[PDB]
PDB file of C-alpha atoms in Angstrom:
ATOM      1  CA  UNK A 503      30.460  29.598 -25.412  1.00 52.12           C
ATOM      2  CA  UNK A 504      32.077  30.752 -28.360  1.00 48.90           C
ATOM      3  CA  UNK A 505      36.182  31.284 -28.975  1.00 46.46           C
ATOM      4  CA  UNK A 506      38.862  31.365 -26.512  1.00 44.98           C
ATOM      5  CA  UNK A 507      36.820  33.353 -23.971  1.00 42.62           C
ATOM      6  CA  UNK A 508      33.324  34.382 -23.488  1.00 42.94           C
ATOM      7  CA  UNK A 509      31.602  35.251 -20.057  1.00 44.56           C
ATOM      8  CA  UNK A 510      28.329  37.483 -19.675  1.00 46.84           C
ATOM      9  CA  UNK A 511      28.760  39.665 -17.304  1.00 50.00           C
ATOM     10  CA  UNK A 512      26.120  38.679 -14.842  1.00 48.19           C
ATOM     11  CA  UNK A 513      29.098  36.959 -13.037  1.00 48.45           C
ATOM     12  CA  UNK A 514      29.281  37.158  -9.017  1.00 49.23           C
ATOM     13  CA  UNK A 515      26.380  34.901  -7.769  1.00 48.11           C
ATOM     14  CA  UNK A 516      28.283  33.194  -4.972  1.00 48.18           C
ATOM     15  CA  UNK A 517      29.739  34.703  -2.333  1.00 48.64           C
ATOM     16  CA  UNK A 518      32.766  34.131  -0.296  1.00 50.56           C
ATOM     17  CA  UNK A 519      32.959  31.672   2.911  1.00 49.89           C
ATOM     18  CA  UNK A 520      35.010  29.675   4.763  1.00 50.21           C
ATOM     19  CA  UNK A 521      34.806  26.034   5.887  1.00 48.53           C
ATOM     20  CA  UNK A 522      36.550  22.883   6.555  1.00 44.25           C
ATOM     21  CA  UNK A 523      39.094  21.704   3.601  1.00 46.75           C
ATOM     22  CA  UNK A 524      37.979  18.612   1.311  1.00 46.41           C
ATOM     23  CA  UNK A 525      40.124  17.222  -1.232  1.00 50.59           C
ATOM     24  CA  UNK A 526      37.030  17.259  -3.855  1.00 52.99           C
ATOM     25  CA  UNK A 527      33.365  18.064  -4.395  1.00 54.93           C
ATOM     26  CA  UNK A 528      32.885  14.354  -3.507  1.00 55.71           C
ATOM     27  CA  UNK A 529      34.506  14.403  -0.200  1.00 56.47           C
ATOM     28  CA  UNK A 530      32.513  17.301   0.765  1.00 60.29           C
ATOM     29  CA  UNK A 531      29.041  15.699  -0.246  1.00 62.29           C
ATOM     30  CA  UNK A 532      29.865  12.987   1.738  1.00 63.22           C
ATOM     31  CA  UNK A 533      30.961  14.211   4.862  1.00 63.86           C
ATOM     32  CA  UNK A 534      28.139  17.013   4.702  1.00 62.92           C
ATOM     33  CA  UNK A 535      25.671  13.923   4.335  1.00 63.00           C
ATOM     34  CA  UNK A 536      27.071  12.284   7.597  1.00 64.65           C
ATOM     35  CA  UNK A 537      26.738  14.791   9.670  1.00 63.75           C
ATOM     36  CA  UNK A 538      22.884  14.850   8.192  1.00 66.28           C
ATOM     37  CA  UNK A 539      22.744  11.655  10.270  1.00 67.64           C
ATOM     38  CA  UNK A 540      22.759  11.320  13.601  1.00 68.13           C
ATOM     39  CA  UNK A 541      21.106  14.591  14.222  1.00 70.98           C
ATOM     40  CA  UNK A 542      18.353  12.904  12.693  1.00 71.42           C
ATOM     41  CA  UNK A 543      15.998  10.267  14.026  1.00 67.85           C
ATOM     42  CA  UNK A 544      15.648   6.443  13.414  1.00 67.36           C
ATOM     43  CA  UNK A 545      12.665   7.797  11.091  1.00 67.85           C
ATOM     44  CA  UNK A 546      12.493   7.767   7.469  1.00 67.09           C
ATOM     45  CA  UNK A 547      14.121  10.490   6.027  1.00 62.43           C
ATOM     46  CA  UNK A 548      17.242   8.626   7.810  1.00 65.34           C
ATOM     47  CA  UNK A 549      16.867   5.573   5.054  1.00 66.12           C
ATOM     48  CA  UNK A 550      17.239   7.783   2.435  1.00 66.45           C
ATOM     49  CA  UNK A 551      20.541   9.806   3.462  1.00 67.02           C
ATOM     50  CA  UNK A 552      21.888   6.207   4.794  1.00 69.73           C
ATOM     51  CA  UNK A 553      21.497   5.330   1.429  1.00 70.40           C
ATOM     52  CA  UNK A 554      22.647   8.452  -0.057  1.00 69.21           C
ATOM     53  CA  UNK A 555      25.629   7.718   1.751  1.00 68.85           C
ATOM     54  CA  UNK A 556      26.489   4.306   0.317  1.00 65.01           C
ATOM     55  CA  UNK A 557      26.014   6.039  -3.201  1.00 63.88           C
ATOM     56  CA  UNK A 558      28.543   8.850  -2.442  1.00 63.38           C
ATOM     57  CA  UNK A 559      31.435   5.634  -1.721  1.00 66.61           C
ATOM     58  CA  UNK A 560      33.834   5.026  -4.325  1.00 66.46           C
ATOM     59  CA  UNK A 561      35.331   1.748  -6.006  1.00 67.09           C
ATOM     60  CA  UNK A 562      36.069  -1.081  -4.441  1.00 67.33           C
ATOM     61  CA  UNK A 563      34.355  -4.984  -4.526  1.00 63.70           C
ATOM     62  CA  UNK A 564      32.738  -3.858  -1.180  1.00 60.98           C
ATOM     63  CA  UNK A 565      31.695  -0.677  -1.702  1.00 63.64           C
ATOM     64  CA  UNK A 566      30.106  -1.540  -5.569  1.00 64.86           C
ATOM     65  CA  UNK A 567      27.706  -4.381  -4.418  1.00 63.79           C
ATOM     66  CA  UNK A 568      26.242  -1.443  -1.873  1.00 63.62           C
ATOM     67  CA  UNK A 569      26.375   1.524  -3.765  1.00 63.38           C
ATOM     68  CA  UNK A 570      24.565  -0.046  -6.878  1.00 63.46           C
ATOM     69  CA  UNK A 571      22.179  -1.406  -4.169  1.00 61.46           C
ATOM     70  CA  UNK A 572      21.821   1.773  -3.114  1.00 62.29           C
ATOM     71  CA  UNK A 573      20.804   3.196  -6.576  1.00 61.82           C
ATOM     72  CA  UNK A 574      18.537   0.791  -7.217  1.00 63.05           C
ATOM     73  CA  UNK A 575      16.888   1.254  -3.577  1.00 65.04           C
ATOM     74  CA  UNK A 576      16.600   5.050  -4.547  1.00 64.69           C
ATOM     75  CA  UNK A 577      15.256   5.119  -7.468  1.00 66.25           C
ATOM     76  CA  UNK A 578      12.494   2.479  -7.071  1.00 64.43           C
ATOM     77  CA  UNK A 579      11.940   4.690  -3.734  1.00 63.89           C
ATOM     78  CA  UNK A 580      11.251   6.977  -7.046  1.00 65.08           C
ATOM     79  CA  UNK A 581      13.104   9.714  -5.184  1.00 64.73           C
ATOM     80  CA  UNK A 582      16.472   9.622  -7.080  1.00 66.10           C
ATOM     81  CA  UNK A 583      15.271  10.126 -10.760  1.00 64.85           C
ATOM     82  CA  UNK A 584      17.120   8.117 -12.607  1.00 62.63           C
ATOM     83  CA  UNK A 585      21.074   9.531 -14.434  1.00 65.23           C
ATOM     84  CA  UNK A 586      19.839   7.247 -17.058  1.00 67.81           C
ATOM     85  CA  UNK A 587      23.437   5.665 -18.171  1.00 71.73           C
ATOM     86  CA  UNK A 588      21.502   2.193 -17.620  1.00 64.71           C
ATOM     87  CA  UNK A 589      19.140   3.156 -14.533  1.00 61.57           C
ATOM     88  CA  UNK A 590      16.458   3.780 -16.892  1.00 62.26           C
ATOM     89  CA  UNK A 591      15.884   0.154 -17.053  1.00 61.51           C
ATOM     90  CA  UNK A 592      16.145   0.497 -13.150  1.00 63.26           C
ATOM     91  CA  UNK A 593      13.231   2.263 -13.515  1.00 64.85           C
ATOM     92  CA  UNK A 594      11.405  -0.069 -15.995  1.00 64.02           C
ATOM     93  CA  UNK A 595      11.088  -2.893 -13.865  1.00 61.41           C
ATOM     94  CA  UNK A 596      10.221  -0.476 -11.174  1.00 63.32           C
ATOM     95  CA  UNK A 597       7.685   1.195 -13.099  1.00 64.73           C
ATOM     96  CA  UNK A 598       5.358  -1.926 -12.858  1.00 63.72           C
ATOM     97  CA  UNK A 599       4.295  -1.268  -9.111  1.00 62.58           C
ATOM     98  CA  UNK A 600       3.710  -4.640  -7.940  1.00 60.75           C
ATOM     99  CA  UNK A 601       2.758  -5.585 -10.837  1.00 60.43           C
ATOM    100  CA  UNK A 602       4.134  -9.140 -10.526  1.00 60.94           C
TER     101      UNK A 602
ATOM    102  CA  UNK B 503      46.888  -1.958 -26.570  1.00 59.70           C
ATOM    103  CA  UNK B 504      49.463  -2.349 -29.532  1.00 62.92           C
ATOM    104  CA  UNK B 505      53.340  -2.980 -29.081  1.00 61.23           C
ATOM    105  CA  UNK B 506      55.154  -3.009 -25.834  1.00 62.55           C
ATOM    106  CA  UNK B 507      54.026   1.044 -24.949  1.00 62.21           C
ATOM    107  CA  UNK B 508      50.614   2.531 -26.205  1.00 65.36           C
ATOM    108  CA  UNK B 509      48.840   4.899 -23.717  1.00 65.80           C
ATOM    109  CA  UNK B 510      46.683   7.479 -24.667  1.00 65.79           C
ATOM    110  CA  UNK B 511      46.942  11.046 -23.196  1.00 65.46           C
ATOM    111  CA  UNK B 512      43.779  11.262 -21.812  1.00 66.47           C
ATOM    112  CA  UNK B 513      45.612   9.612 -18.836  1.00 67.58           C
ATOM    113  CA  UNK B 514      45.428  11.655 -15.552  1.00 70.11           C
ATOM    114  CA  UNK B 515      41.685  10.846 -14.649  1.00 72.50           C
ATOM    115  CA  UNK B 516      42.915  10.092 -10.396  1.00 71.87           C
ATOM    116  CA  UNK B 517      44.446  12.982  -7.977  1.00 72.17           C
ATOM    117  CA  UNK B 518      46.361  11.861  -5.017  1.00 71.04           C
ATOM    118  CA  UNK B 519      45.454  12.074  -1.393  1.00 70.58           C
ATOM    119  CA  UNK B 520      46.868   9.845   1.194  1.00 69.50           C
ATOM    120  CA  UNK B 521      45.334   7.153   3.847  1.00 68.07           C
ATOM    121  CA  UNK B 522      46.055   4.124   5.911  1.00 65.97           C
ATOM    122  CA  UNK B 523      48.613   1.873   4.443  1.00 65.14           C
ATOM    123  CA  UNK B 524      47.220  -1.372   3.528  1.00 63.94           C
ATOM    124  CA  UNK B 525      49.456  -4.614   1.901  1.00 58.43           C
ATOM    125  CA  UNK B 526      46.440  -4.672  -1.259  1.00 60.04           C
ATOM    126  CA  UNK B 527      43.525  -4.002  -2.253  1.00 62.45           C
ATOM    127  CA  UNK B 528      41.589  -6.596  -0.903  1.00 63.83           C
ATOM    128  CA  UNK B 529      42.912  -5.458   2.425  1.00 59.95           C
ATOM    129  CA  UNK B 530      41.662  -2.018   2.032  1.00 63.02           C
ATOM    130  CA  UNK B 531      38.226  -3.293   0.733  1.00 62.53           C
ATOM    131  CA  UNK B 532      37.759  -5.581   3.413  1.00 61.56           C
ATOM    132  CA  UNK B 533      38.740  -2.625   6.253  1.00 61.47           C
ATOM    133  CA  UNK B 534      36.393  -0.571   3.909  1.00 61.93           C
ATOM    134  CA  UNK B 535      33.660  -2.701   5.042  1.00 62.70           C
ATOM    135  CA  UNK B 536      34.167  -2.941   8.483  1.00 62.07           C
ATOM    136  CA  UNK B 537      34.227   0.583   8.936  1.00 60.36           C
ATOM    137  CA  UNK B 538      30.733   0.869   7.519  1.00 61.50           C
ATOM    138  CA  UNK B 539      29.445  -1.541   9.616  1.00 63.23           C
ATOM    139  CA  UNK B 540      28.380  -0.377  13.165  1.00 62.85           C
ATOM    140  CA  UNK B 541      28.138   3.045  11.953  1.00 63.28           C
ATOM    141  CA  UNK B 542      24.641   1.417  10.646  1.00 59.23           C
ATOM    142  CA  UNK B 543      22.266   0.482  12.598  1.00 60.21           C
ATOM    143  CA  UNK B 544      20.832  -3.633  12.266  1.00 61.77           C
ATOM    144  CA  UNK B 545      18.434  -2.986   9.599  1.00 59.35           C
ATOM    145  CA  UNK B 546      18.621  -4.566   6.585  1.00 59.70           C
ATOM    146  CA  UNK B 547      21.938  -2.921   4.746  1.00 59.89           C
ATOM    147  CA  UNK B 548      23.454  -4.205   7.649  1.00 58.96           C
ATOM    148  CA  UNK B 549      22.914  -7.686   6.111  1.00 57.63           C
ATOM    149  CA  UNK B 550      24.450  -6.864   2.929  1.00 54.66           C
ATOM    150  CA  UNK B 551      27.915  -5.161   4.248  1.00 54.27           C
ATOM    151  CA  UNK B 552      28.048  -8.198   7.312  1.00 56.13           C
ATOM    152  CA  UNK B 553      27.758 -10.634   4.016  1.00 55.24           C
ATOM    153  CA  UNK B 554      30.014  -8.621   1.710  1.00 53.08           C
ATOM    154  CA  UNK B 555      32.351  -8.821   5.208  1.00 52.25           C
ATOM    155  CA  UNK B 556      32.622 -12.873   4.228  1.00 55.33           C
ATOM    156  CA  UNK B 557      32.888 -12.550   1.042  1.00 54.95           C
ATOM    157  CA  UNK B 558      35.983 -10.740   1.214  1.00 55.00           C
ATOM    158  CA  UNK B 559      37.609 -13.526   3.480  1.00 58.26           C
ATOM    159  CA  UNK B 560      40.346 -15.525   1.804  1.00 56.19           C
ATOM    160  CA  UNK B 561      40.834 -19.032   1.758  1.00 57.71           C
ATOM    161  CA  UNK B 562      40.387 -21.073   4.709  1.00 58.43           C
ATOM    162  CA  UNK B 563      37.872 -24.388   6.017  1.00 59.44           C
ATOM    163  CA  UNK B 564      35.955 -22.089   8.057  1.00 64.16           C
ATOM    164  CA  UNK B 565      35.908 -18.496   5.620  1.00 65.56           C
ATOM    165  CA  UNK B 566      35.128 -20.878   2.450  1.00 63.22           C
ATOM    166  CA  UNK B 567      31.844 -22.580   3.835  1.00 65.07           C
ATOM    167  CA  UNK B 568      30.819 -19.317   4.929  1.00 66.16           C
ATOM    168  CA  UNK B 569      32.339 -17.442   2.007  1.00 66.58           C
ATOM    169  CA  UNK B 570      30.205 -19.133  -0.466  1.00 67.19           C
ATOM    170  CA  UNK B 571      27.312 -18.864   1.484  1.00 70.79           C
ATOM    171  CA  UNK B 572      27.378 -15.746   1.453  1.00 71.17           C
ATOM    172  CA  UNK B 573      27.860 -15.374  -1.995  1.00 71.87           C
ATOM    173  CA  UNK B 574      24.673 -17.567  -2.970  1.00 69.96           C
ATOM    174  CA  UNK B 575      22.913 -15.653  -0.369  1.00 64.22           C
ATOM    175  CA  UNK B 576      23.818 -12.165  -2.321  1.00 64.40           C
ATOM    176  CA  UNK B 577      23.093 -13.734  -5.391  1.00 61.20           C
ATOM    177  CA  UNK B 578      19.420 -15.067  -4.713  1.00 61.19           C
ATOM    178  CA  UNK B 579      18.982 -11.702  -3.055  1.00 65.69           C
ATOM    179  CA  UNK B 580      19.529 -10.300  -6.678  1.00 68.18           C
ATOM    180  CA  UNK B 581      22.199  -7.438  -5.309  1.00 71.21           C
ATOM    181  CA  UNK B 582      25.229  -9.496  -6.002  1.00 69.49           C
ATOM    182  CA  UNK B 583      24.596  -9.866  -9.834  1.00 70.50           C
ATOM    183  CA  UNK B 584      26.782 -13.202 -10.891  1.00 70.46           C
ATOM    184  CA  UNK B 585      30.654 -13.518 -11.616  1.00 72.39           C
ATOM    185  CA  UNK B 586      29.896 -16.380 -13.275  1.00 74.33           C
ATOM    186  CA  UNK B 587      32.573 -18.985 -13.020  1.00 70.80           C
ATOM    187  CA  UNK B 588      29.786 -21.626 -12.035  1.00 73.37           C
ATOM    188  CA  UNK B 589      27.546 -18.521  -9.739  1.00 77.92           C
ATOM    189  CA  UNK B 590      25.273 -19.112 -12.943  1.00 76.56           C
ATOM    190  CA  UNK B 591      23.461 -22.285 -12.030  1.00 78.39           C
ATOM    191  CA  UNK B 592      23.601 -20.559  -8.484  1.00 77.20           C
ATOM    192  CA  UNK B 593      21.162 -17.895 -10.396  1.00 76.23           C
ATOM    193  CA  UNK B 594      19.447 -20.444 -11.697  1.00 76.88           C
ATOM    194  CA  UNK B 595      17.666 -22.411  -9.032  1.00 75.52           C
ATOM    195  CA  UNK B 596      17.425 -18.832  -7.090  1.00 78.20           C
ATOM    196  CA  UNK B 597      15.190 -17.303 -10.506  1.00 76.69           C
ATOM    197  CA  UNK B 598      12.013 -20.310 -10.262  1.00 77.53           C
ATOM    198  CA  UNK B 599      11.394 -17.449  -7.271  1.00 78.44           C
ATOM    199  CA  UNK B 600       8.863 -19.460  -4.746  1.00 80.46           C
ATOM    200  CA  UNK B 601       8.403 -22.094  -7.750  1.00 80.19           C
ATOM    201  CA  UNK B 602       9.203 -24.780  -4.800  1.00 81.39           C
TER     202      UNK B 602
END
């Protein structure tokens, strides 16, 4: 935008509803992903929110080892699309497709 | 930083929200784990948290054997990615890959 303030006026494109409290955007995105699971199957689409889930987790030496496992799992799945900080190179060595 | 006080004021980056109490963060890493075990099923990222699981343990005659073998074991997976205090040469005989 430009100067202290500067909306257009196509404003209002959510609407109001209520729901359980979360301290952050984080939290939510994580708990809405576990209860994606269970009322799903032992199929395939169940990998990828398991996953999901371990990349939602935040610091620790535990939680790292996983969720960067997790990363790499998803994007040579080719589904995540790499953020590209590094994972680009994720992608690289991906990109070969058993190449060898 | 520079002389005995030097913090810049891009400091507030955490909020606060409360949880178990734990005596340090190795503790809490270590419960972290746990917790995400049997809430997977035994496929294979099972593996990884049961191995992270020994990792975690602190000193001992039985944790170290097993310790370490887990570490190797996460390190010729490729996930663990090495510390290097010696985990190098662990690397090494893990990258000849098949070579025999």
């Amino acid at each position: 935008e430009k100067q202290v303030l500067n909306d257009i006026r196509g404003r209002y494109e959510c609407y109001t509803d209520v729901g359980p409290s979360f301290q952050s955007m984080k939290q939510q995105n994580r708990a809405e992903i576990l209860e994606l699971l269970g009322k799903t199957p032992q199929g395939t689409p169940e990998y990828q929110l398991l996953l999901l889930q371990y990349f939602t987790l935040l610091d620790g030496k535990g939680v790292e080892m996983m969720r960067d496992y997790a990363n790499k799992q998803l994007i040579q799945m080719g589904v995540k699309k790499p953020e590209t900080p590094e994972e680009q190179q994720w992608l690289v060595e991906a990109q070969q497709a058993k190449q060898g």
